[model samples]
Target chain A: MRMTLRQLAVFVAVAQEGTVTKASDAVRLTQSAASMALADLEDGLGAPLFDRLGKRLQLNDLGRFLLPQALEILGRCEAFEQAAKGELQSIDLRLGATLTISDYLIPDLMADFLQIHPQAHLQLQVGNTRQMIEAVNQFQLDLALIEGSCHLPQLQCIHWRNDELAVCCAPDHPLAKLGRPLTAQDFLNVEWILREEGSGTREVFDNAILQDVPDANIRLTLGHNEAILKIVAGGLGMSCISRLAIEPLIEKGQLVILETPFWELTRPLHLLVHRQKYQGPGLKAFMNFCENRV
Target chain B: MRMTLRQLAVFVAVAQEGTVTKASDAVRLTQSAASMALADLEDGLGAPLFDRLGKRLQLNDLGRFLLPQALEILGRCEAFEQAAKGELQSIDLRLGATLTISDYLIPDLMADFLQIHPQAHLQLQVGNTRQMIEAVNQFQLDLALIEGSCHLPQLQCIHWRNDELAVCCAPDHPLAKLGRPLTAQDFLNVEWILREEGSGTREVFDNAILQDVPDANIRLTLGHNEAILKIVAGGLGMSCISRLAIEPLIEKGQLVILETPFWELTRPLHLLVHRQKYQGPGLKAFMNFCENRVN
Candidate 1:
């Protein structure tokens, strides 16, 4: 190739930072050196990658086309280096998890995992089950911890553990002591704070979690587990989220799990990996660690 | 190709629904008919798309490859059909917004827009500014309303509106009585409920929004706008979300904006679109409506 990888890396950095001066700080290069590398990259390609606008650099069409490619090239080089010497140190893993897992499970896991692999970087993307599934499908996530049952045929799903989502409320709320296993009629009566659509928690909650509460008067649809549980703790509404997220609060006597017929709504969590993704040494070692973890 | 779009459609449906019986419900075909359609599709391709697991159908390698392709093929057919008769009645637009914009701005816009195009499908994905940027970059969303400054030169950023995020607490909270524009000392003293990292709101809040509060006490970081605001409303702690989200509650006297020097932190919102993306008439019409709307 006409351009060196160092020059390409500098170009990529400048493109991402939107200015050579700002990007210099990231690449650990003097501004003048970084500027020269970018110039050399453009001169080698015989084209300008960026459009100069005032003080900022914007990716023109050429720069736009080059960015994703440059990123992949650099990534391949890094992975190639990693493969030559398989080490957990300096390893970067991009993983995804559903909200409940992100809040309750991963935070606990990170402490142990990082203790062993302190230099390893885990980029955890937090989202709902549906989003996690999509991320896995797109290869944007290397592996994902998900709650909703996945039917996607391509990913290899290893069942992680069994967890349950229960209808929860504040200790003194009306539904609090009415702790009898609530029926559809009762479910229809009370105001609810539920996880927003696309949540693994909501999937079962909606499988009416099939009477499908057509008019269950959902007072709030919150995105985060603790936030929903917190609101429910304040006695405004009731919710259904993972017992893992709700347990600490329940033990603290801030919230109560309303006994509902939907205890059958317990779900299995999963560790998802794309079957077609190339398994390099570092990724495989990480997978082995995940599978072996107690 | 020996397959009809109907057969491919049935195959796609069965693959997603996990069974021919369930796929029948969605495709409006009988089980027997849906089963035959999928069978024909597999036979025509000379390959199996699924591994039948009792009542369920799991996509095999061939099926896995076909699903996305089939989805795109069917999507193209639907859009091609839609194009022949340009109308908003059956239009579908995938959009994204930051938490504040998703909760406050789009909800109100949805009401007005739907009144005119009642059958239009506007799939609004809610995320922080960072996630919104990625969605737009990936073309997962057709357009995005983001709050943070977007510097990616590939994206076409159009100026939308200016909005401010203010420190807020329950009316009776101690910070509630201390209504002066607080300093770093006051900020350091109070516990806060904040939007999680990657939020457009949090970006400014973190730019220290720079004494960069090295030891700022964030009691909780909630994902949604209202949930953070609601936690503050319950007298637990304070938060900073958009005035758009907090204005009504402030008017109702449920929460008070503790006067903050950070009011200068008002940021401009943006409408982000991919420059290289094709501009069909329907999308263009929608964009026109968005640009002309009076907030």
Candidate 2:
């Protein structure tokens, strides 16, 4: 029952790669050594650990059950070693971001920081606004770049950036050709392509359009952002999207950004963290990197 | 910028507990050591992780962003070690069971096992029969103890045990008055409480009673096991339930198990696993435990 730290690491490598040979390669061990270590482990436990069928190895009931626990034990050991170093350099950072931020903002920020601190590890959790905020609050993420300002009392947030919204339509649509001023009611009967509910963009559009034209018929509900643009471009229906989001398509004339008074609509992005959490070395460095950039 | 694992652990503990004193106690470190570690970590990263607001500590934006990744890195390291140790003693068993099996079978099995492996970790995922089987096939669980056969391709199964279904009624019900030699016609006028659609018990009841009394009037539909028993015992209706589920109540005379045709009821209990998935030391050990008990 007394197993060393090294043996557990070997077991994880083996289980993750699904073979002793692959695991040996991963852990930088000779194939015979890896086989001997695993064989000794099984003998110590008094059970056949892996159901070796042909060349591939399948985790039997016992292996599957112990996988998570073994992983946790090994992780704790690594964390201990990392913490023992005098100052927290080579820190690992986990960041969650809404799609808008993930697509537009993080790439530049990450690239710049990586150049300066090549040893720091970074992971990105990408999801919609709701998912990203939840990740921050639940301790699954270290920081979140989210759309809209803070509404959750459990999280501390800072203003990151602001973005403008625009109405987009195909070139041949009736409103696309309108030269004079047109109110929100001008497209009362227009078929609409909309994002899934709970999206920030959808929230802005619903409050503005549905409130003005409650009887407006929505033709379809699509979840993918690119699909929504393509559907609008194909003249299936018109969509309201972030001006920043539709810039490339707008420039190419594949989609037209409407110059309506909807330009007054805006949503601010915020950097958020759980009030109970702590920033590590990697995170603080990244935040400074962002603060300097934007 | 090399950092040690213990610093991250102390930082994670401090982040979780919100105070260095408490975090140090959690990781078995002296308070000053924990405080020094956090400060050192912050200094190396070139930013303050916690904003000292009055006597309490709060994670700044940077702190929140880094915690999860740090935790994952730490977790992965711990997993690597446990895998290295061939000892399956401290394993956390992942078990998926149907609600019915979770309710009726797992409690006793766990009670007996935990007494022996008290420090072992156990996580139970409970859902319907179909959901439990799918979880097993998807590699989300080590073993699934379910009520029916595994129908998915590439899934292996073993019949663990069998449960008997019964014609159940309350002690004061009208059907309870007709003790013996009851016909299918006698069930016609009785108010029947049925389980929700897709339940094995409901399926058996429907196939049996509905065969003869095709138009039997069903009085109510209930989802929970104990709720169905309570409603039936309240003299509202008659229901068919697992005899094992209601054995205590039946023995206590709170409910009555009527004599139904033997041909009408039986369901098999099964343990299912993905045939292609490897059973590691811990998982195989647990399976051996179950196999020994069943054999």
Candidate 3:
């Protein structure tokens, strides 16, 4: 159970070669040591792998069944080690972010970050803000670019920027031609395509709606931002989302962001991390890169 | 890239605990060795995974990214070793078979084999006859119960039993009404459900059909035996298959085996192994079990 990689290499060679003498030659180990290692492996497993056949050796059923799994164990180690090695070899900055940032902010940031830190190793993992903050706390990332504000007691929150939430509708929607800001009751009976329950945009929109239309009719919950936008454009229902995330669609005339109570509709973009952790050399370099740009 | 499970385990603790001293306590390694091992791991990875913070340590982006995968690698090793220990501690009766024998003989053989070797671990792998012979040659299995004849030069082949292939049809089929023996050409225009190309039954039936119905049209090729039988029983097509494998369905009046040429219809069952390999105590016991019933 406590076997090392070297022992596994010997195990595979011995299992393949079918004899201690040949296995020792393959792994460059002394014949006695090869025999000892096989004995140790069998001791660890509490069973014999082979039955002596004169001067040769052959695998028993137990040994045969374990061959593929042992090979897989070694293969995964190689892949894991390779990824680790690649991270250290390059001056590339590793970056983590929520799906929202990767979906909206990253393309422009990556384009500029690459021009400056051309040699930096860029590694990224995208999740929700909570997941991004958890990775930062667990030391699975140096710094994470997250959407919305942070409230986790352990994490330090830095306001990076802000964006407005705008209601969207098909060009022919009844509310599209209303001319001015409409109260919540105006949309009470209207069918709406909404964000999934936990999203920052949905939380803000739901809070604002409950003030007047306490029982707002949000008929659909779409998780993907672009999919939600498409359903709104197709006359399915109205939706509310960040202007920064939907501006291109608006300019393309595929969507229209309503001018609602713009002050009440705004949300902040925040950078978050556990306050107690120190930034490592690679992470420090990447943070400097962000400070110059944003 | 070839780092071992233990190395990954130590590496994970160091990354999580944030210092070699703390990691050493976590994984029960002495501080000096843990420090040396971390140096070796970093050297192997060609990068520093941690930034020493005077009295503490912090993972750089590279270290953070690798922690999850390092834990996974170590976890896989633990699972594999546990499974290997289970296999090593128990004595299992290893059995090998060609697909045909696995389909036809295994159910009956296992029902009896289990009654006797009730405490015995049972390991079985199915392949073609050639592959089963090679498993025996390599001593990967104790005995192989196969459903055809063998002419391999280096192995011993003992004829264990026999089963007949029947040309079967649904009860509503025109062939089911025939009272006399039918010529092979009677199947020329009839729709047929044949087994996949490599099947032993398909090979025998193809040779038998070519003597008269040289240009027989097979409507579909299905790999599963029951699917083919179900299709045939629903009057979809005619098929030739093992009587033993389909006996229950035939007894239910779902199918009728047409009266046809019985010559070359019966095939021999064989138990094969390399002549030079010694049968161990468990294998010897299973072979005795086969011999008593097969003869």
Candidate 4:
């Protein structure tokens, strides 16, 4: 209960380096001091954090659980020092974005942002909308860019942009040569490669097709968008994904978009913020930059 | 240290849901039971895990530190149960891979592996070789596939495969149109987009190029092979990366491989396991599958 950040820092160092000697070197402490710090930390917590295998120390369940929290605390402490020194340019930003956006859109956007604010430290975590929302709600993230609907009432969700979904397949697919507006009946017999159950893209696509063809054949359910793109491009099955994801491939003639009259799927991307959390100057600048630039 | 797996499970539920009511609902426990479990957990740890922010409960630093470990225990417990039941088909596999292998190769390999064993539950974590080795050593992962050199003596490292590296640039790059073999002098003036520090790819590339031309211009250091590929395709600079990563793009004419006589970079990819750890049947099966299948 009375553990200090120094003890936690030493514990994290040991967890990372796997030896007291290497951890001591990393933290600029003597081996004896490092060992004492870890011993004190374990004593305070009333449980051993690691399993010692002779010369090596490995994180057991207790240590694994504590590492992230320690890292978070250390990150905040560093940010606080920067703020106190009036070094606004060096603020650390922890941002989360869902799969589609992180893969296709955020990279370019981040590149552009970094060009102007080169001194800013950025850490990005890519996950599903559900995970991003949870991180934002828990204040572990400064903000999250999401593609799906936000069901939590504790967060403020703002519509950032609109994205269109395209029904796409490999250039060699039979439907690619259809050359006409396809009816709902045309889609009834086609095999589909779909996103996993909890994906935002899946939720939107499922809703759009449910009314027209309630029992569309789904052959594969995968998590990664790039994997789905590659599978579709390999002539496996048709999939509906954000047009932004496949634009480069489409231009290269790897994929073909089929025209369907029954579906006009569009979804909004949102930026979520915890309602009660304070927006620091760095966060404010980032939000402003996204609004003005993106 | 008198904590049970049930209490840890309850603690993780509360950490995720953020409230006793929601956590109780999630774990199918009575509200009173949930409260008591959490209190017991806090008492065992000798710390206040949650900060009472009015009506809502938020995980304090201690609680945040414990949540992942709790979840890991629960996951392992479930895996143990499945193993005990002889449910080999439903065994959970935790695997790690370095960036190059994860991005360029593992997707198709995993897809194929899953098709043959559709009931296998697989979870993958992608990082650099350093992170992967640490994870394996900590028993967070059953095994890791790495593309870089393994210097850690505590882990068992098996050479899995050899991967070739190529010096790549945009299609319109001057070196791409040189129509002749490149030497060390040709690379000296070119701007480079190198991988971040601690990457296996970077380590191999740095060593190879440093021996040839020590002062090659490195304009930027970025993570992620795909990002570097895009930037190169956008005519920003050149990079040395796994040839497997750029093969599809090269075929599409999005990137060009500059033939270099001075550098022929090849690195061994390794399968790492904790030397002291017990290899379960499921883990053994995967190692065997990777060995017999990948080559």
i-RMSD values for every candidate model: 10.6, 27.3, 25.4, 4.8
| Winner by lDDT | 4
Q: Name the candidate, 3 or 4, with the larger lDDT value.
A: 4
- Writing each residue's lDDT as its tens digit, candidate 2 over B32-148 gives 888888888888889987789765788889989999988998998898888667554455667766646666666556545544554455555555677677788788888887875
Scanning candidate 2 chain A in windows of ten residues, the lowest lDDT window is A219-228
lDDT of 3: 0.68
Fraction of native contacts under 8 Å reproduced by each candidate = 0.00, 0.00, 0.00, 0.03
Write candidate 1's Cα lDDT for A1-294 as tens digits. 778888977886776456888778656799999989998889989999888898888888878667667767766777778767864335556677776776566644643565566455454666777778777665556788888878889788888888887878788876566646566566666667677677788887888443646777664565556555655665446777788888898789888877777447788889998775555444666777766766
TM-score of chain B of each: 0.65, 0.66, 0.63, 0.68
lDDT of 2 at A173: 82
> Pick by DockQ: which candidate is best?
4
Report DockQ per prediction, comma-separated: 0.03, 0.01, 0.01, 0.06
- The residue pairs in collision within model 4 are A65-B65, A66-B65
lDDT of 1 at A204: 78
Model 4, chain B only, scores a TM-score of 0.68
Candidate 4 yields a Cα-based lDDT of 0.78
Assess every candidate by TM-score: 0.45, 0.38, 0.36, 0.52
Model 2 ranges with Cα > 4 A deviation: A1-88, B1-295
Candidate 2: tens digits of C-alpha lDDT, residues A1-294: 656666776776776556888788656799999888888878888887678888777678887677557756755555566678855455555577765565556655654565576455555555567877776654456688787546889888888778787788887888878888877778778777676577777777787778777887664554445555765776536777777768888788888876668435687878887665545455666777776765
Sort candidate 1 into its docking category.
Answer: incorrect
Q: How far in Å is the alpha carbon of A154 misplaced in model 4?
A: 2.6
